Coordinates of C-alpha atoms and ligand atoms in Angstrom, one line a residue:
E1 CA -8.6 -19.4 4.2
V2 CA -11.6 -17.4 5.9
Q3 CA -13.2 -13.9 4.6
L4 CA -16.0 -12.0 6.6
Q5 CA -18.1 -9.4 5.3
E6 CA -20.5 -7.3 7.4
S7 CA -23.8 -5.6 5.7
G8 CA -26.8 -3.5 6.6
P9 CA -28.2 -0.2 7.0
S10 CA -25.8 2.7 8.2
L11 CA -28.6 4.9 9.6
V12 CA -31.4 3.3 12.2
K13 CA -33.8 5.5 14.4
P14 CA -33.6 5.4 18.3
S15 CA -35.5 2.7 19.5
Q16 CA -35.5 0.6 16.8
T17 CA -33.9 -2.9 16.0
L18 CA -30.3 -2.9 14.2
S19 CA -30.1 -5.7 12.0
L20 CA -26.7 -6.6 10.4
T21 CA -25.5 -10.0 8.5
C22 CA -22.3 -11.3 8.3
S23 CA -21.3 -13.2 5.0
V24 CA -18.7 -16.1 5.4
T25 CA -16.4 -17.3 2.5
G26 CA -13.1 -19.3 2.2
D27 CA -12.7 -22.9 3.4
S28 CA -14.8 -25.0 5.6
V29 CA -14.5 -24.8 9.5
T30 CA -14.7 -28.2 12.2
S31 CA -14.8 -25.4 15.3
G32 CA -14.1 -21.5 16.7
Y33 CA -16.6 -18.6 17.1
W34 CA -17.9 -15.9 15.5
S35 CA -17.9 -12.8 17.4
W36 CA -19.6 -9.3 16.8
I37 CA -17.6 -6.4 17.8
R38 CA -17.9 -2.8 17.6
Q39 CA -15.5 0.7 18.1
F40 CA -17.1 3.8 18.8
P41 CA -16.4 6.8 17.5
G42 CA -13.4 7.8 19.3
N43 CA -12.2 4.1 19.0
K44 CA -12.8 2.0 21.8
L45 CA -13.8 -1.5 20.8
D46 CA -16.5 -3.1 22.7
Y47 CA -17.2 -7.1 22.5
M48 CA -20.4 -8.0 22.2
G49 CA -20.7 -11.8 22.0
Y50 CA -20.3 -14.9 20.0
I51 CA -22.2 -17.9 18.8
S52 CA -20.2 -21.2 18.1
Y53 CA -19.9 -23.7 15.7
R54 CA -22.2 -25.5 18.3
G55 CA -24.7 -22.8 18.1
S56 CA -23.7 -21.5 21.6
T57 CA -23.9 -18.0 22.3
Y58 CA -22.6 -15.7 25.0
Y59 CA -23.5 -11.7 25.2
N60 CA -21.8 -9.0 27.0
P61 CA -24.1 -8.2 30.4
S62 CA -24.5 -4.6 29.2
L63 CA -26.3 -5.9 25.8
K64 CA -27.9 -9.0 27.4
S65 CA -31.5 -7.7 27.2
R66 CA -31.1 -6.6 23.2
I67 CA -28.8 -8.6 22.1
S68 CA -28.9 -11.8 19.9
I69 CA -27.1 -13.2 17.6
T70 CA -27.7 -16.3 15.4
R71 CA -26.2 -18.3 12.2
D72 CA -28.0 -19.7 9.4
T73 CA -25.5 -22.1 8.3
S74 CA -26.9 -23.1 4.8
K75 CA -26.3 -19.9 3.9
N76 CA -23.1 -19.1 5.7
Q77 CA -24.1 -16.1 7.8
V78 CA -24.4 -15.0 11.2
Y79 CA -26.4 -12.6 12.3
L80 CA -26.6 -9.8 14.8
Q81 CA -29.8 -8.0 16.0
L82 CA -29.6 -5.2 18.5
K83 CA -32.9 -4.1 19.9
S84 CA -34.3 -0.5 21.4
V85 CA -31.2 1.3 19.6
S86 CA -29.8 4.9 20.8
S87 CA -27.0 7.0 20.1
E88 CA -24.4 4.9 22.4
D89 CA -24.8 2.6 19.7
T90 CA -23.4 4.6 17.1
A91 CA -20.2 3.1 15.6
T92 CA -18.5 0.6 13.2
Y93 CA -19.5 -3.0 13.6
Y94 CA -16.9 -6.0 12.9
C95 CA -17.5 -9.7 13.2
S96 CA -14.5 -11.8 13.6
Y97 CA -13.7 -15.8 13.5
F98 CA -11.6 -17.3 16.0
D99 CA -10.3 -21.1 16.6
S100 CA -9.2 -21.5 20.2
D101 CA -7.3 -24.2 18.6
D102 CA -5.0 -22.2 17.1
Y103 CA -4.3 -19.1 19.3
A104 CA -2.5 -17.2 16.5
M105 CA -5.0 -16.2 14.0
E106 CA -7.9 -13.9 13.9
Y107 CA -10.0 -13.1 11.2
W108 CA -12.2 -9.8 10.8
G109 CA -14.1 -8.2 8.3
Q110 CA -13.9 -4.8 6.7
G111 CA -16.6 -3.2 9.3
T112 CA -19.6 -1.5 8.5
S113 CA -21.0 1.6 10.2
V114 CA -24.2 2.7 11.6
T115 CA -25.4 5.6 13.3
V116 CA -28.5 6.2 15.4
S117 CA -30.5 8.9 14.7
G128 CA -30.4 -5.7 31.4
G129 CA -28.4 -7.9 33.6
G130 CA -25.0 -6.8 35.8
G131 CA -21.9 -7.9 35.3
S132 CA -18.0 -7.2 36.1
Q133 CA -15.0 -6.9 34.0
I134 CA -11.5 -6.3 33.7
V135 CA -10.3 -2.8 32.4
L136 CA -7.4 -2.2 30.4
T137 CA -5.5 1.5 30.5
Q138 CA -3.2 2.3 27.6
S139 CA -1.3 5.4 28.7
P140 CA -0.4 7.7 26.6
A141 CA -3.3 8.0 24.4
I142 CA -1.3 9.6 21.9
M143 CA 2.5 9.3 21.2
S144 CA 5.2 10.8 18.7
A145 CA 8.6 9.3 17.8
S146 CA 11.4 9.6 15.3
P147 CA 11.8 6.7 13.2
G148 CA 15.1 4.5 14.6
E149 CA 13.9 5.4 18.0
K150 CA 13.4 2.0 20.4
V151 CA 9.6 2.5 21.3
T152 CA 7.5 0.8 24.4
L153 CA 3.6 1.0 24.4
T154 CA 1.9 0.2 27.7
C155 CA -1.0 -1.8 29.0
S156 CA -2.1 -2.0 32.4
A157 CA -5.1 -4.4 33.6
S158 CA -7.6 -3.4 36.4
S159 CA -7.1 -7.2 37.2
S160 CA -4.8 -9.9 36.7
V161 CA -5.3 -11.8 33.2
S162 CA -4.0 -14.8 31.7
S163 CA -0.9 -14.0 29.7
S164 CA -1.7 -16.4 27.0
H165 CA -4.6 -14.3 26.8
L166 CA -3.5 -11.2 26.5
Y167 CA -3.4 -9.9 23.0
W168 CA -2.3 -6.5 20.8
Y169 CA -4.0 -5.6 17.6
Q170 CA -2.5 -2.7 15.3
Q171 CA -5.2 -0.4 13.2
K172 CA -4.8 2.2 10.5
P173 CA -7.5 4.5 9.4
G174 CA -10.1 3.2 7.3
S175 CA -8.9 -0.9 8.0
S176 CA -9.9 -3.2 11.0
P177 CA -7.8 -4.3 13.4
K178 CA -4.8 -6.9 12.7
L179 CA -4.1 -9.3 15.5
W180 CA -0.6 -8.1 15.8
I181 CA 0.8 -10.1 19.0
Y182 CA -0.9 -13.1 20.8
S183 CA -0.6 -14.5 24.1
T184 CA 1.8 -11.5 25.3
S185 CA 5.1 -12.2 23.1
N186 CA 3.9 -13.9 19.9
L187 CA 4.6 -12.2 16.9
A188 CA 1.4 -12.9 14.4
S189 CA 1.9 -13.6 10.9
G190 CA 2.5 -10.3 8.8
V191 CA 4.1 -8.9 11.5
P192 CA 8.2 -7.6 11.5
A193 CA 10.3 -9.0 13.5
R194 CA 11.1 -5.7 15.1
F195 CA 8.2 -5.9 17.2
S196 CA 8.1 -7.7 20.9
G197 CA 5.7 -8.1 23.8
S198 CA 6.3 -8.9 27.3
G199 CA 4.7 -9.3 31.0
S200 CA 2.7 -10.4 33.0
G201 CA -0.1 -10.6 35.7
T202 CA -1.6 -6.8 35.4
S203 CA 1.2 -5.7 33.4
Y204 CA 2.1 -5.8 29.7
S205 CA 4.1 -4.2 26.9
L206 CA 4.5 -4.1 23.3
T207 CA 8.1 -2.8 22.1
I208 CA 9.2 -1.8 18.8
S209 CA 13.2 -2.2 18.3
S210 CA 13.5 0.5 15.7
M211 CA 10.6 2.8 14.6
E212 CA 9.9 3.0 11.0
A213 CA 7.4 4.8 9.5
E214 CA 4.9 2.0 8.5
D215 CA 4.7 1.5 12.5
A216 CA 2.6 4.5 12.9
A217 CA -0.8 3.0 13.5
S218 CA -3.1 2.8 16.5
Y219 CA -2.1 -0.4 18.9
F220 CA -5.2 -1.8 20.9
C221 CA -4.4 -4.5 24.1
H222 CA -6.8 -7.0 24.2
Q223 CA -7.7 -9.6 27.3
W224 CA -9.9 -12.6 26.7
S225 CA -9.1 -14.4 29.9
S226 CA -11.9 -13.3 31.7
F227 CA -15.6 -12.6 30.5
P228 CA -16.6 -9.8 28.7
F229 CA -13.6 -9.8 26.9
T230 CA -12.6 -6.8 27.0
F231 CA -9.9 -4.0 24.8
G232 CA -8.0 -1.0 26.0
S233 CA -8.3 2.3 24.8
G234 CA -5.9 2.4 22.4
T235 CA -2.3 4.1 22.2
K236 CA -2.0 6.3 18.7
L237 CA 1.8 6.3 17.8
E238 CA 2.7 8.8 15.3
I239 CA 6.3 9.8 13.6
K240 CA 7.9 13.1 13.6
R241 CA 9.0 15.2 11.7
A242 CA 6.7 17.1 8.6
Ligands
1WF301 C1 -8.8 -13.3 20.4 N1 -10.3 -12.8 20.5 C2 -11.4 -13.1 20.7 C3 -12.8 -12.3 20.8 C4 -11.5 -14.5 20.2 C5 -12.6 -15.4 20.8 C6 -11.9 -16.1 22.1 C7 -12.8 -17.0 22.6 C8 -13.9 -17.2 22.4 O1 -14.8 -17.7 22.8 C9 -14.7 -16.6 21.0 C10 -13.9 -15.5 20.6

């Protein structure tokens, strides 16, 4: 019912202002949040901020100074403006829609890459180890996520990503599979310790898996575990 598409320049000069647009299509909505999320070289996901259905904004403290997220509802668009960019802002930028009245779904755009030529805060860090893992098909596979402080298990999510594709919501609220996910997948955990399991590894499960916490602000993502198959 909802599609998002990011657009804007692929290249920006240092100290310039990065501007991106998110064109929203599909069905009309009565609530929710439009979030900008970017993914660095190396694949770390960074939660930037959102604008709600009532125009409320939240900005990650580490950007607070430089960022604004606005809407133009008559033309169904949401905007990202980032001032004073540097090489550290080089990333793929995604917009995403979520309705907290429906925990089980999240929509992402395709993502658009951008290369570049205030206020304090705190964050839960999420560690996924190992960073890379190989397994044979048929093996039972377990990926872990360790949070530096407790998080609510209803707000611990997992994503899958394949090369040339945006993250898809894989598990929500620790143990609930999302639409599109085979039932060989499971999840479990609590407090600071969470896991994702594949009962039997299929070839199509080779992908990157990120955990994600939106129990505490700013929401954060783990560094990811890249899961590979064995046998060339
Ligand atoms: C599940 N990922 C979150 C980024 C979705 C979200 C949750 C709450 C919110 O206020 C805005 C967005």
